[PDB]
Structure 1
Amino acid sequence: DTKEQRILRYVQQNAKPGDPQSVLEAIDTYCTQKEWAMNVGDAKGQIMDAVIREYSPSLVLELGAYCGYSAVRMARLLQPGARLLTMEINPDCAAITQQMLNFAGLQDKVTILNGASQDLIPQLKKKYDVDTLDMVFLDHWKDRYLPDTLLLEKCGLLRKGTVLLADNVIVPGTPDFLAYVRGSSSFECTHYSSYLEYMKVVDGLEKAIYQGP
């Protein structure tokens, strides 16, 4: 039995089926009262909400699903017809995420892709008929942010206006990623400060808006 299963079980026992809000609230309650887990969380969730509302992406890509907290957070604000693709390398996490989406009633707006981002990204065009992305949420292994971003660039999946939203750019930290996007005229960056309450340390998100090549 694992932490992630315990989270899922707490939700099935306490949340209301078909109700994404109550699912979020239960995950936050559990991970705040019983055992911490690396969900983006409610504070950073507020920033993610504002971003989705401002840009109204029709096609979103998430890197790193874990227990589905962030997938549920975003999918619940998507407009009719909009969709979320989420890539998860670990099949145990994809399973928990799938069940979390099922319980929330969001399964028709979200598609889980099983694999490593770098394996799946070059397949997006021809296998999943993607033209370009409207938004990408990066929240997988920190060493992957930069190479995957350059890979997204090279496969031609970004367009002028595409919103990159990167979590944990301070802790554990993604210095090479930040240096690249902040350094580059191809991206316009904003930093959103946020505090990780359990670890009592300042973190943040970076919003990088692509300008084209």
Structure 2
Amino acid sequence: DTKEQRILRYVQQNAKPGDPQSVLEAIDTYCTQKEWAMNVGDAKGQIMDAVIREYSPSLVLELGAYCGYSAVRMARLLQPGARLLTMEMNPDYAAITQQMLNFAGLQDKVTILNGASQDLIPQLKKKYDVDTLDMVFLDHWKDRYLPDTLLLEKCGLLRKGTVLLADNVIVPGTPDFLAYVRGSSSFECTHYSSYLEYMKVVDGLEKAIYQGP
């Protein structure tokens, strides 16, 4: 058994099917009382909720689902008919995420794509019928934030006004990404200071809005 499987089982044993908030609470409780895990957490999660409500995106991409905590957060706030695509390379975690979303009742709003972002991003247009993305949440390996931002642009998936939202810009940090977006005329950036999930350690989210080529 893995820690990720243990989180899923705790939600199944302690939350209410079809109630996303109960799922989020259960995961937070497990990760605070039993075993830490790299979910975005409630502190940063409340900032993400405020961003999602401000922008009301019709199509969101998440890079790195993990166990589906942030996918539950985001999908529960989507307007009716809006959609989330979430990419997760680890097949075990992809299945956990699918089951988390099923449990929460959010499965009709989300598509969980099992594969690496560098493989799946170039397929979005033709295979997933994407035109452009309204919002992207970056939460995968930190050294892939910049490569994948640049791939998304190459592939034509960013429009003027696409909102990038990046986790962990302080801890662990993503120094190439952060320097790049902050220094580029192609992005307008805002920093939201917060705390690392389940810890009294400063972290933050970066919002970087694409300005066009």
- Give the Å deviation of 1:198: 4.5
Taking the aligned partners of 1:21 and 1:198, their CA distance within structure 2 comes to 17
Gaps of 5+ in 2: none
The superposition leaves residues 15-63 of structure 1 with CA deviations (integer Å, 9 ceiling, x where unpaired) of: 0000000000100011011110000000100000000000000000000
- Relative to structure 1, is the Cα distance of residues 34 and 76 closer, same or farther in structure 2, using a 3 angstrom cutoff? same
The superposition leaves residues 175-201 of structure 1 with CA deviations (integer Å, 9 ceiling, x where unpaired) of: 110111000010000001112265532
Taking the aligned partners of 1:183 and 1:21, their CA distance within structure 2 comes to 38
Taking the aligned partners of 1:206 and 1:122, their CA distance within structure 2 comes to 24
SS of 1:130's equivalent in the other structure is: coil
SS of 2:159's equivalent in the other structure is: coil
- Relative to structure 1, is the Cα distance of residues 197 and 106 closer, same or farther in structure 2, using a 3 angstrom cutoff? closer
Comparing both chains, which one has the higher relative contact order based on Cα–Cα distances under 8 Å and sequence gaps of 6 or more? 2
SS of 1:80's equivalent in the other structure is: coil
The aligned counterpart of 2:206 is 206
- Give the Å deviation of 1:202: 1.2
- Relative to structure 1, is the Cα distance of residues 41 and 99 closer, same or farther in structure 2, using a 3 angstrom cutoff? same
The aligned counterpart of 1:65 is 65
The alignment's TM-score, normalised by the length of structure 1, stands at 0.98
SS of 1:11's equivalent in the other structure is: helix
Taking the aligned partners of 1:199 and 1:172, their CA distance within structure 2 comes to 13
The superposition leaves residues 132-165 of structure 1 with CA deviations (integer Å, 9 ceiling, x where unpaired) of: 0000000000000000000001101001111000
Taking the aligned partners of 1:209 and 1:63, their CA distance within structure 2 comes to 17
Aligned length: 213
Taking the aligned partners of 1:87 and 1:20, their CA distance within structure 2 comes to 20
Taking the aligned partners of 1:17 and 1:50, their CA distance within structure 2 comes to 25
Taking the aligned partners of 1:134 and 1:120, their CA distance within structure 2 comes to 17
Taking the aligned partners of 1:198 and 1:180, their CA distance within structure 2 comes to 29
SS of 1:165's equivalent in the other structure is: strand
Q: Percent identity?
A: 99
1:104 and 2:111 equivalent? Answer: no
- Relative to structure 1, is the Cα distance of residues 35 and 91 closer, same or farther in structure 2, using a 3 angstrom cutoff? same
Residue 181 of structure 2 contacts residue 189 of structure 2 at CA under 8 Å; is this kept in 1? yes
The alignment's TM-score, normalised by the length of structure 2, stands at 0.98
SS of 1:50's equivalent in the other structure is: helix
- Relative to structure 1, is the Cα distance of residues 140 and 36 closer, same or farther in structure 2, using a 3 angstrom cutoff? same
SS of 1:67's equivalent in the other structure is: coil
- Give the Å deviation of 1:72: 0.2
Residue 41 of structure 2 contacts residue 197 of structure 2 at CA under 8 Å; is this kept in 1? no
Taking the aligned partners of 1:71 and 1:197, their CA distance within structure 2 comes to 16
Taking the aligned partners of 2:196 and 2:172, their CA distance within structure 1 comes to 11
Taking the aligned partners of 2:138 and 2:196, their CA distance within structure 1 comes to 17
Taking the aligned partners of 1:26 and 1:197, their CA distance within structure 2 comes to 14
- Relative to structure 1, is the Cα distance of residues 159 and 172 closer, same or farther in structure 2, using a 3 angstrom cutoff? same
